[PDB]
């Protein structure tokens, strides 16, 4: 009964689309027509970190807004210090190919990952004075693209095998497995409540994941191309996407709809990283045209530019206190914009 | 700042070690090897990794063999390589359209516009033994004729050489139709018993670096 199943799926999709249309009595762009602007946000390269040699693929900000972790293709993880541009650790990598890097919420651990099909959980607060690989999470069949800690005992992983899986560090076993997507998943972002997380994949779609229950909640299909990087609004209710079709978009869980298209005609490049400012008025987004922009989340018009880089912007993160912005690009440099 | 001085000392030591590690690996050429499973994936040179040496230059190979298909993403990481090694099984005619489409996809990738592609038409002997019995070529093949200036190997049958040059012609034609001189293919014919492949890769890499330098210097 293939025809019956296809008709049922079509009916479900039509009902979902009709509900989406019905729930949209307004566009947030219109509602943002009575809000004051933000103006030109001129940011300067307060610090320039020059440790790396090859390109930089990902980086994460510490919970204290002072420690930075960056992963480059030279097989080196460096835990910087933004306040004094001096390195703390230089974690070597078994696999030179790295596409993700995480920093534990408690500052104890740091995770990596890449084409090696394994997530390595390193230990920073070691009694012996040398960071060591506490465990290797080696259950995946594809290539990892994003790791983000929930606590000191569970790490979530996005792998190009079309599956995301919450892990348990101690047992090194896949505690939960998410098996919904139909293509490579490229990024995920953790909700502040830590009971939820989103993952956007190469099939031009997004899905919110119930970490506890294990079943997805909603599917968003607003993009025309891949979804390289995804962020999560600090409020815990919205997530902004970065796709390869020169488009960044805003989605809201409760509304379950599209809300913005942060795009312009003069940009025909791709978006590699996305982040939100602490108060949510700034949606920073890296771009493939050698530079990274600073978008105003509400008005959606551009409100600045960061032209300090001479290669693809690959990563971008705003501190937990909103006192800095970091941008890593294939130029093997990090710059802390304030 | 009695403690920050030691922090700066740690930073300097880490910078020194990072510089040493970078120095150890700059002078090594990188290659990505990709091809069909039926093809001689691993027999060409005699995630996965491999290393070999030719003329005191270190060649550093790679072989993903970890993802089924849809390479549109992990290929991005390999956009700084010196050459891509493409291996196609010539004997399996029924599995040549897929190989041609894969070559077209590799050639026309936005992140590989500057990366040259080596081509190894592996299983040449098997092709020589496959034409003969029940081998009508599915595409058009009568129209073709061996070029007058052809230089076939001594004791090479006209049927064998016309088939071989037809395969090479298909692949080269797919290569030139869109490439704007930035990157160029380098066809080769190899058998399982062949042992000269390292020299061929070395020559291709030398030519690739030569043309890169010509472009850099506008010469």
């Amino acid at each position, epitope marked *: 009964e293939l025809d019956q199943l296809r008709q049922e799926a079509e009916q479900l999709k039509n009902q979902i689309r009709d509900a989406r249309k019905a729930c949209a009595d307004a566009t947030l762009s219109q509602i943002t027509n009575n809000i004051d602007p933000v103006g030109r946000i001129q940011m300067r390269t307060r610090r320039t970190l020059r440790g790396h040699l090859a390109k930089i693929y990902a980086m994460h900000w510490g919970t204290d807004s*002072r*420690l930075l972790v960056s992963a480059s293709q030279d097989g080196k993880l460096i835990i910087w*210090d933004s306040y004094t541009t001096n390195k*703390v*650790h230089a974690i070597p990598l078994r696999s030179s190919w790295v596409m993700t890097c995480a920093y534990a919420p408690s*500052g104890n651990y740091v995770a990596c990952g890449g084409l090696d099909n394994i997530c390595s959980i390193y230990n920073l*607060k070691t*009694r*012996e*004075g*040398n960071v060591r690989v506490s465990r290797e999470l080696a259950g995946h069949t594809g290539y990892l693209s994003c790791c983000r800690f929930l606590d000191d005992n569970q790490i979530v992983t996005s792998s190009g095998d079309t599956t995301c899986a919450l892990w348990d560090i101690e047992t090194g076993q896949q505690t939960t497995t998410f098996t919904g997507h139909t293509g490579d998943v490229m990024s995920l972002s953790l909700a502040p409540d830590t009971r939820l997380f989103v993952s956007g994949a190469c099939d031009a779609s997004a899905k919110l994941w119930d970490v506890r229950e294990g079943m997805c909640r909603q599917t968003f299909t607003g993009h025309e191309s891949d979804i390289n990087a995804i962020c999560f609004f600090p409020n815990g209710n919205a997530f902004a996407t970065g796709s390869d079709d020169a488009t960044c978009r805003l989605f809201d869980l409760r509304a379950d709809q599209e809300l913005m298209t942060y795009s312009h005609d003069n940009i025909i490049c791709g978006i590699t990283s996305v982040s939100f400012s602490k108060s949510g008025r700034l949606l920073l987004a890296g771009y493939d045209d050698f530079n990274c922009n600073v978008w105003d989340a509400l008005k959606a018009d551009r409100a600045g530019v960061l032209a300090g880089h001479d290669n693809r912007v690959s990563c971008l993160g705003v501190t937990d206190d909103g006192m800095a912005v970091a941008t890593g690009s294939w130029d093997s440099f990090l710059k802390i914009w304030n | *700042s*009695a*403690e*920050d*001085k*030691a*922090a700066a*000392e*740690r930073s300097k*030591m880490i910078d020194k070690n990072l510089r040493e590690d970078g120095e150890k690996a700059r002078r090594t050429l990188r290659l990505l090897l990709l091809g069909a499973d039926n093809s001689g994936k691993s027999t060409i040179v005699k995630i996965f990794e491999t290393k070999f040496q030719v003329d005191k230059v270190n060649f550093h190979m790679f072989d993903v063999g970890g993802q089924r298909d849809e390479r549109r993403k992990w290929i991005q990481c390999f956009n700084d390589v010196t050459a891509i090694i493409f291996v196609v099984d010539s004997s399996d005619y029924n599995r040549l359209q897929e190989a041609l489409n894969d070559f077209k996809s590799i050639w026309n990738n936005r992140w590989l516009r500057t990366i040259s592609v080596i081509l190894f038409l592996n299983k040449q002997d098997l092709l020589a033994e496959k034409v003969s019995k029940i081998e009508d070529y599915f595409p058009e093949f009568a129209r073709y004729t061996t070029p007058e200036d052809a230089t076939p190997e001594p004791g090479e049958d006209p049927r064998v050489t016309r088939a071989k040059y037809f395969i090479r012609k298909e692949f080269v034609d797919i290569s030139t139709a869109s490439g704007d001189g930035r990157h160029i293919c380098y066809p080769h014919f190899t058998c399982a018993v062949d042992t000269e492949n390292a020299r061929r890769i070395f020559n291709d890499c030398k030519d690739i670096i030569l043309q890169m330098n010509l472009r850099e210097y506008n010469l």
Partner: single-chain antibody, 232 residues
């Protein structure tokens, strides 16, 4: 982790003898090393300092030149060669480790030291009393005063507390006047106003009996304070 110190014995005044420390169970190369002396039935006194790479050496005002500190990374052995020995130098020298990066815990582990027996601008720091009788489960707070303010511009107060239980080596309880080190009970707490800090214990126990100590790690000299004898 464990450190060992070699030496001990008797040396005629004016003679010489070298102390060697052996390490086992940590990355000696990424860690600095310290020497702290203690005359019998007396307080502590910082002796020397050798950092990773041996590119930063400090000496005490009363050891410089005579005593030299050298570390051998390949075979994990540390030496503090001594030339001139006098009666005032009869003290059982200890060794201490310290790694200096943000979030570090300097002066984390202490060896056992070897008993050596011989036949003005510094940041002075004073401790109120020599002894304080107490009772179990009682919270006794020590007082300590800093001649110079220890809140360096970067916002950190550089005060380290310690505990030399009877017949053992010092164990670090507080390393920057606020932070509690690993492996010590949560009862210990640190407080500070900016010039004179205090150390507190929620409930005195058997293991909490000993002599406490303080550090002034703002500048190259490291001044200790006369310990306070806690008993019951």
């Amino acid at each position: 982790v464990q450190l060992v110190e070699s030496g001990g014995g008797l040396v005629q005044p004016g003679g010489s003898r070298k102390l060697s420390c052996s390490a086992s169970g940590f990355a000696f190369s990424s860690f600095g090393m310290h020497w702290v002396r203690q005359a019998p039935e007396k307080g502590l006194e910082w002796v020397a300092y050798i950092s990773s790479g041996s590119g930063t050496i400090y000496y005490a005002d009363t050891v410089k030149g005579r005593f030299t500190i050298s570390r051998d990374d390949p075979k994990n052995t540390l030496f503090l060669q001594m030339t001139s020995l006098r009666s005032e130098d009869t003290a059982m020298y200890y060794c201490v480790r310290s790694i200096y990066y943000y979030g570090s815990s300097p002066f984390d582990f202490w060896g056992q030291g070897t008993t050596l027996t011989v036949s003005s601008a510094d940041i002075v720091m004073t401790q109120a009393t020599s002894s304080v009788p107490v009772t179990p489960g009682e919270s006794v707070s020590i007082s300590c005063r800093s001649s110079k303010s220890l809140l360096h511009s970067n916002g950190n107060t550089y005060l380290y507390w310690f505990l030399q239980r009877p017949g053992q080596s010092p164990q670090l309880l507080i390393y920057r006047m606020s932070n509690l080190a690993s492996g010590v009970p949560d009862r210990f707490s640190g407080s500070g106003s900016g010039t004179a800090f205090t150390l507190t214990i929620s409930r005195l126990e058997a293991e909490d009996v000993g002599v406490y100590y303080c550090m002034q790690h703002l500048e190259y000299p490291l001044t200790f304070g006369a310990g306070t004898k806690l008993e019951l």
